[PDB]
Design a protein around this ligand. Structure first.
Ligand SMILES: *[C@@H]1O[C@H](CO[C@@H]2O[C@@H](C)[C@@H](O)[C@@H](O)[C@@H]2O)[C@@H](O[C@@H]2O[C@H](CO)[C@@H](O)[C@H](O)[C@H]2NC(C)=O)[C@H](O)[C@H]1NC(C)=O
Ligand SMILES: *[C@@H]1O[C@H](CO[C@H]2O[C@@H](C)[C@@H](O)[C@@H](O)[C@@H]2O)[C@@H](O[C@@H]2O[C@H](CO)[C@@H](O)[C@H](O)[C@H]2NC(C)=O)[C@H](O)[C@H]1NC(C)=O
Ligand SMILES: *[C@@H]1O[C@H](CO)[C@@H](O[C@@H]2O[C@H](CO)[C@@H](O)[C@H](O)[C@H]2NC(C)=O)[C@H](O)[C@H]1NC(C)=O
Ligand SMILES: *[C@@H]1O[C@H](CO[C@@H]2O[C@@H](C)[C@@H](O)[C@@H](O)[C@@H]2O)[C@@H](O)[C@H](O)[C@H]1NC(C)=O
Ligand SMILES: *[C@@H]1O[C@H](CO)[C@@H](O)[C@H](O)[C@H]1NC(C)=O
Ligand SMILES: *[C@@H]1O[C@H](CO)[C@@H](O)[C@H](O)[C@H]1NC(C)=O
Ligand SMILES: *[C@H]1O[C@H](CO)[C@@H](O)[C@H](O)[C@@H]1O
Lengths: 121, 193, 203
């Protein structure tokens, strides 16, 4: 339906928020910060794992400022994720056994959104 | 000790060619390719069942559509068949390694006497591509280029009827379904006059 | 009798309230009440035309992203009757369904010839959420004619210049452009940019 297109457009906006952070990063203490990573990320409830890492994401982007507005940006990602994720149950998402750098974190969640976007087309 | 590097490309999500150049080896050698996917049912290590050859030596593998999982991490392993411990592994992200076929069926139509619209098709989910349009006239010493998103139309809002126009288009699997960097081949051009 | 608002895609929602009948003479405001943000905002409605009122809800700095496509903002017109505030109009405002961007800016001549001119422009206060899903329309004022007679030149892509062909030499022209995103059911064109004056070379 067009709730599928609504979902798709929400995923695109999330993706553009993430790509913007990643593009901003690619232009030191930022690259040592470690992020929890989803064990599995194939359906929308797994965004729980992105949601839970938004506070540490915000903190790292605040520390690095010297072309992003992280309070706005994170609060935007937060509401989009909350809408996409669905109603909260137990065992939404499980973490991998190792943490990762910010670039691996962002690329993982970028890959996630891309994977759902392509099935909704 | 150091094996040749494998390079994989998913062509229009129909099949994947993985290739390597093994003339860096001290003799001619048929290296073997195994692959598997991370975090999956496809943990079972697969053997290449369609080798590619270059000077009668293995230089690549072809995987079919069934064996492609664009968003699951792809692990490719080269191995010396006469020396088991000698092996190199890479983790590939296939969604960044897609190359679409060139766009097709370029058509022009008039919005007015001096405004043209270029249209085209891709054999591919329209949404997952962006495009680069190039055009020129018989008065121009070079192509003018302009990028275009999944809409896959291009307006030319001021046309000179005295000039002859040429158009071509290429496409890329970026940025909504993947972050590939390579462009397709150029389409066959079309002309207007 | 109608209540119509548009979002610039960043931090500005502008509202118009048109009455069809008895005209208010007391204070009226627009109140913005977002369903998932910690702030409310208001603006005082001032007359703009014969029966319409307008004001702007400034949510933050000019280029800050204060709303998203999942936000829903209850917009209400509240007018003062005696000491009480009366709700005179209400909508559930979906900001990315009601977009109207700022007019393009920084128009300049890139290169001008005898029969041709390349003109470039920039957009302003435009969300990164659009990526390149924008379009433009332009038009040229000629010596003979009016703006209303000038044909609309269509750009169905994010292209921030135009090369105008088949112009007359040593002739005085003016040029305008406007923009919109392709997203949103009620999305509408920006206003026209300021006209840029230019002159073709003489030959
Ligand atoms: C906030 O927006 C208003 C209104 O601008 C219109 O609505 C917007 C959503 C957008 O679509 C704009 O392109 C529209 O023009 C701005 O107020 C207008 O400013 C112009 C020029 O100064 C003036 O001629 C009009 O009278 C104004 N209209 C009203 C109703 O006040 C205002 O400047 C914007 N402020 C910022 C900081 O963006
Ligand atoms: C943003 O506004 C909403 C709704 O605002 C209206 O609520 C009326 C009761 C009245 O105050 C009117 O002037 C106002 O504009 C606020 O929600 C209200 O808050 C209190 C709880 O604090 C509740 O008792 C009301 O039920 C609730 N109203 C409704 C209609 O739900 C909200 O508090 C306010 N937010 C901020 C940050 O100011
Ligand atoms: C009209 O003007 C601009 C020059 O500023 C041209 O567009 C630029 O083209 C260069 C390469 O030629 C790019 O690197 C810039 O990014 C372009 N800028 C923009 C805003 O698109 C444009 O090609 C000129 N038009 C013609 C027909 O020559
Ligand atoms: C390399 O391989 C060529 C043909 O393929 C091989 O032959 C079949 C029967 C299987 O063994 C398969 O695994 C191989 O890929 C040979 O004709 C050629 O002689 C081989 N060359 C060397 C140097 O080993
Ligand atoms: C990929 O491999 C197959 C088999 O060798 C071949 O048909 C195809 O042309 C190859 N190359 C490309 C660029 O597709
Ligand atoms: C191009 O046109 C042909 C013939 O009319 C058609 O069969 C084919 O599907 C078109 N190609 C694409 C990619 O749509
Ligand atoms: C922009 O332009 C025309 C005239 O204003 C209308 O068809 C419509 O508002 C569109 O969005």
């Amino acid at each position: 339906s067009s709730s599928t297109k609504k979902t798709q457009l929400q995923l695109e906006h999330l993706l553009l928020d993430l790509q913007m952070i990643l593009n901003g990063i690619n232009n030191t203490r930022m690259l040592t910060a470690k992020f929890a990573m989803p064990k599995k990320a194939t359906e929308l409830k797994h965004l729980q794992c992105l949601e839970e890492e938004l506070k540490p994401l915000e903190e790292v982007l605040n520390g690095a400022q010297s072309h992003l507005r992280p309070r706005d940006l994170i609060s935007n990602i937060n509401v989009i994720v909350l809408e996409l994720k669905g109603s909260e149950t137990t065992f939404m998402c499980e973490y991998a056994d190792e943490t990762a750098t910010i670039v691996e974190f962002l690329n993982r969640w970028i890959t996630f959104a891309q994977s759902i976007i392509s099935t909704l087309t | 000790l150091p094996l040749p590097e494998v390079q994989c490309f998913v062509f229009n999500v129909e099949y994947m060619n993985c290739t390597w150049n093994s003339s860096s080896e001290p003799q001619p050698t048929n290296l073997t390719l195994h692959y598997w996917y991370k975090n999956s049912d496809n943990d079972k290590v697969q053997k290449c069942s369609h080798y590619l050859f270059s000077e009668e030596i293995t230089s690549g593998c072809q995987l079919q559509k069934k064996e492609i999982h664009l968003y699951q991490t792809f692990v490719v392993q080269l191995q010396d068949p006469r020396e088991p411990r000698r092996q190199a592994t890479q983790m590939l992200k296939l969604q960044n390694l897609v190359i679409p076929w060139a766009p097709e069926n370029l058509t022009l139509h008039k919005l007015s006497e001096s405004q043209l619209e270029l249209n085209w098709n891709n054999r591919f989910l329209n949404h997952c591509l962006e495009h680069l349009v190039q055009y020129r006239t018989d008065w121009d010493h070079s192509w003018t280029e302009q990028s275009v998103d999944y809409r896959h139309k291009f307006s030319l809002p001021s046309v000179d009827g005295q000039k002859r126009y040429t158009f071509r288009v290429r496409s890329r699997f970026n940025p909504l379904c993947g972050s590939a960097q390579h462009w397709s081949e150029w389409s066959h051009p079309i002309h207007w006059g | 009798s109608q209540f119509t608002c548009f979002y610039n895609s960043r931090a500005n929602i502008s509202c118009v309230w048109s009455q069809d009948g008895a005209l208010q003479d007391t204070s009226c405001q627009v109140h913005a009440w977002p369903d998932r943000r910690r702030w409310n905002q208001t603006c005082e409605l001032l007359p703009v035309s014969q029966a319409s009122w307008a004001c702007n809800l400034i949510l933050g700095a000019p280029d800050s992203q204060k709303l998203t496509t999942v936000d829903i903002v209850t917009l209400r017109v509240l007018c003062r009757e005696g000491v009480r505030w009366r709700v005179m109009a209400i909508q559930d405002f979906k900001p990315f369904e009601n977009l109207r961007l700022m007019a393009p800016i920084s128009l300049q001549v890139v290169h001008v010839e005898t029969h041709r001119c390349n003109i470039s422009w920039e957009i302003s206060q435009a969300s990164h959420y659009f990526e390149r899903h924008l379009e433009f329309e332009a038009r040229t004022l000629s010596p003979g004619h009016t703006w209303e007679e000038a044909p609309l030149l269509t750009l169905k892509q994010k292209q921030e210049w135009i090369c105008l062909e088949t112009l007359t030499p040593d002739t005085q022209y003016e040029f305008q452009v406007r923009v919109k995103p392709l997203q949103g059911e009620f999305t509408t064109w920006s206003p026209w940019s300021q006209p840029l004056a230019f002159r073709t070379k003489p030959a």
